[PDB]
């Protein structure tokens, strides 16, 4: 019950595939490069029991040669085989193995080249540890393989093996206790995130809060609720919002990022690739695959158009995406935040634009990403000199020595710690979140062309999924009224960034005409003019000629009611 496997590492020097020569045979060597086509693992004979050999020799050992046949060699005595082996499989101990062909890396290879590459076989428990696309340190063992010479009583080639492979190519919570003491690490975690960006404030938070997880769980029975969080940041190009995005990929784990129109469609969707060839239906990932459980990023929704808009929105509700070309029936685990930034369809604000018509996209995918968090970037003279101050300090190669209060990597390990929390407010002061959410829609109630949306029933779930991450921020669980208050108002800005029964229609517009106009003007002149712009917007949503006339004689009848 013992078979021991040797591995040697930290080898003298990395050698190229172009460096591969016959001298290296039977010798240790370090090489690294990209995977191609990992093949399924199938056992190594090592030793076998095969016998008899005519008729039972039961001889069990060795036969470890590379064929691997056969036993039956020089048995028993007296069995005199020759004969059958006969193969005895059960006593044979097996191990591993899979063939993985490595490709030579692009950065080193001298274009035009077309890198010439051979197989790395994984013999040893070091098998399977590899992942496609990565470069990895290997152990040499040049040797050779059978399919120019022939053994007269053949053809050979390079077979690369490694007895050892690495994928290259504690007390810091005591740092974290020190960090989880302060009140101030809440604002600290904020000014410490992206130095490459200046100002923009609240939006920063969400980014963090995006890397931070939500509940993304329960409550049965039934569907998994969200969970997650989502942000589409917008503003006039030159905004320097993209500086956020490279910060996503340049900070966050397993970050997938593409802005392009061309994915294409599938894309985050599967292709499906046909012909493979040979029976085909080969299912592309595509795109978002390793993106699963990660922060996905896009630019310029104008430049992904409308075709795929809701097809990447499958994961924005179901959180998983099935994919149909008339391929084979499938569904895919997508669970991810999707953050992005389109440039506004006017290129600017478009103050007046309700953000709904601001985006050039549909509420199902729009209402779902919460929340957008508008930033318009403008000139201001001081600010022109402050952009000429700090943005300059970024322009600066030096001083680039200005630093955040948090070392970036310690912020990451703080997250990897903050990713452990599963904070839950069961607390009865979530009653306050009701009133809040109630008063969240009491205002958006009119106009329905306002921030509404509604705002969406999902924005209650969103209201929750905000304080989910607020908790990981403050590291305590069960949250609080203050915590959600943060997030609620925090929505409230970017919903305000969207801002710029006979007599129930009459007392509607009696105080509504003044609601849109008595703040922006006098609410004066005559009584019947208030009727005349109303014969404009009344006729279009009324459902008869009779419902037109009670939009007439009632706009008469309430006038002589209040006159």
């Amino acid at each position: 019950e013992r078979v021991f496997q040797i591995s040697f590492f930290n080898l003298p020097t990395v050698h190229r595939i172009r460096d591969i020569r016959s001298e290296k045979i039977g010798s240790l060597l370090s090489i690294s490069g990209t995977v191609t086509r990992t093949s399924e693992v199938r056992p190594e004979l090592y030793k076998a029991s095969f016998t008899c050999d005519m008729c039972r020799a039961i001889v069990d050992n060795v036969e470890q040669s590379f064929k691997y046949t056969e036993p039956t060699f020089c048995p028993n005595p007296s069995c005199e085989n020759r004969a059958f082996w006969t193969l005895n499989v059960t006593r044979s101990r097996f191990l591993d193995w899979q063939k993985v062909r490595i490709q030579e890396n692009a950065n080193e290879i001298p274009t035009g080249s077309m890198p010439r590459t051979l197989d790395v076989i994984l013999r040893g428990d070091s098998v399977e540890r590899a992942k496609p696309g990565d470069r990895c340190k290997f152990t040499g063992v040049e040797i050779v393989v059978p399919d120019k010479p022939s053994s007269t009583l053949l053809t050979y080639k390079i077979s690369f093996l490694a007895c050892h492979v690495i994928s290259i190519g504690s007390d810091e919570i005591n740092e974290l206790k020190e960090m989880v003491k302060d009140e101030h690490i809440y604002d600290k975690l904020v000014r410490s995130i992206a130095p490459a960006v200046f100002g923009h404030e609240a939006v920063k938070k969400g980014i963090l809060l995006q890397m931070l997880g939500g509940v993304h769980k329960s409550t049965v029975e039934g569907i998994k609720l969200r969970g997650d969080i989502n942000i589409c940041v917008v503003g006039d190009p030159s905004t320097s919002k993209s500086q956020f995005l490279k910060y996503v990929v340049g900070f966050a784990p397993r970050s997938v990022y593409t802005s392009g129109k061309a994915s294409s469609a599938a894309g985050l969707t599967a292709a499906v690739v046909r012909d493979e060839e040979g029976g085909d239906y080969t299912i592309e990932a595509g795109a978002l695959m390793l993106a699963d459980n990660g922060i996905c990023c896009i630019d310029e929704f104008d430049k992904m158009d409308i075709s795929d808009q809701v097809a990447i929105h499958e994961a924005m509700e179901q959180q998983t995406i099935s994919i149909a070309k008339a391929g084979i029936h499938a569904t895919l685990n997508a669970r991810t935040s999707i953050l992005a930034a389109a440039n506004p369809v006017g290129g600017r604000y478009n103050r007046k634009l309700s953000l709904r018509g601001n985006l050039n996209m549909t509420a199902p995918i729009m209402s779902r990403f919460d929340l957008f968090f508008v930033i318009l970037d403008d000139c201001n003279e001081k600010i022109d000199t402050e952009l000429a101050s700090h943005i300059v300090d970024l322009h600066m190669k030096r001083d680039e020595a200005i630093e955040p209060p948090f070392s970036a990597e310690q912020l990451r390990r703080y997250i990897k710690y903050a990713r452990t929390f599963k904070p839950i407010l069961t607390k009865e002061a979530r009653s306050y979140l009701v009133e809040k959410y109630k008063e969240l829609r009491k205002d958006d109630a009119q106009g329905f062309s306002r921030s509404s949306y509604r705002i969406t029933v999902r924005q209650l779930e969103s209201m929750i999924r905000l304080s989910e991450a607020i908790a990981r921020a403050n590291c305590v669980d069960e949250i609080t009224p203050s915590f959600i208050a943060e997030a609620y108002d925090l929505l409230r800005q970017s919903i305000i960034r969207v801002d710029v029964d006979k007599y129930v229609s009459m007392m509607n517009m009696i105080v509504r005409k003044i609601a849109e106009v008595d703040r922006e003007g006098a609410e004066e002149l005559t009584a019947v003019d208030i009727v005349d712009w109303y014969l404009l917007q009344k006729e279009n949503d009324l459902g008869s000629l009779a419902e037109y006339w009670e939009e007439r004689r009632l706009a008469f009848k309430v006038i002589k009611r209040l006159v």
């Binding site: 990209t34 274009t111 496609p132 990022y257 802005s259 129109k261 390793l290 440039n343």
Partner: protein, 205 residues
Amino acid sequence: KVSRQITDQDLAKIREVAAREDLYSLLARSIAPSIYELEDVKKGILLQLFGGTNKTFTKGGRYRGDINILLCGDPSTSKSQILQYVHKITPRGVYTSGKGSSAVGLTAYITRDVDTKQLVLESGALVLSDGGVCCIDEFDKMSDSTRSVLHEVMEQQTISIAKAGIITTLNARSSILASANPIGSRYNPNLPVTENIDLPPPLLS
């Protein structure tokens, strides 16, 4: 053998050329011996091969030295001559036309090895340019999937290939010069500039 380690004594011949006053003009006039006037072009293109410096920070950064430059004017300016020239001087050069460019065209064709029957990742015209200088014709005339590899490397300064068997998002960093023409091809006197440059001013930003 064929159809560069620097010697020491011409290095102080370099600094000798450095004390020479007109090296900013001089080398430029040595850039394009074929072309008359347009000295701001030789000027710029001089500074193109000297373009920028690497900022690696602690992390992120990598704004590089990379500089794109557009040029255009009256049709056939001898722009294609400076492209066809500078293209050849370069350690890694790149050149193509408008309408001869698209998204699918310049990155990772990932074709089969053919004769050995094995799919092997191929570098597209953009991966090889990584470092050095690209060149193209008439950005007004580029297709819609064209610019989709551009929106991709201008800032990302990388390229993302996850498809088929193997996944790599690999870097591309190089300065670039595309020749072009106004829509006219005369851009006509007066007029607002943006439309006259074709394209929206957001894309030109």
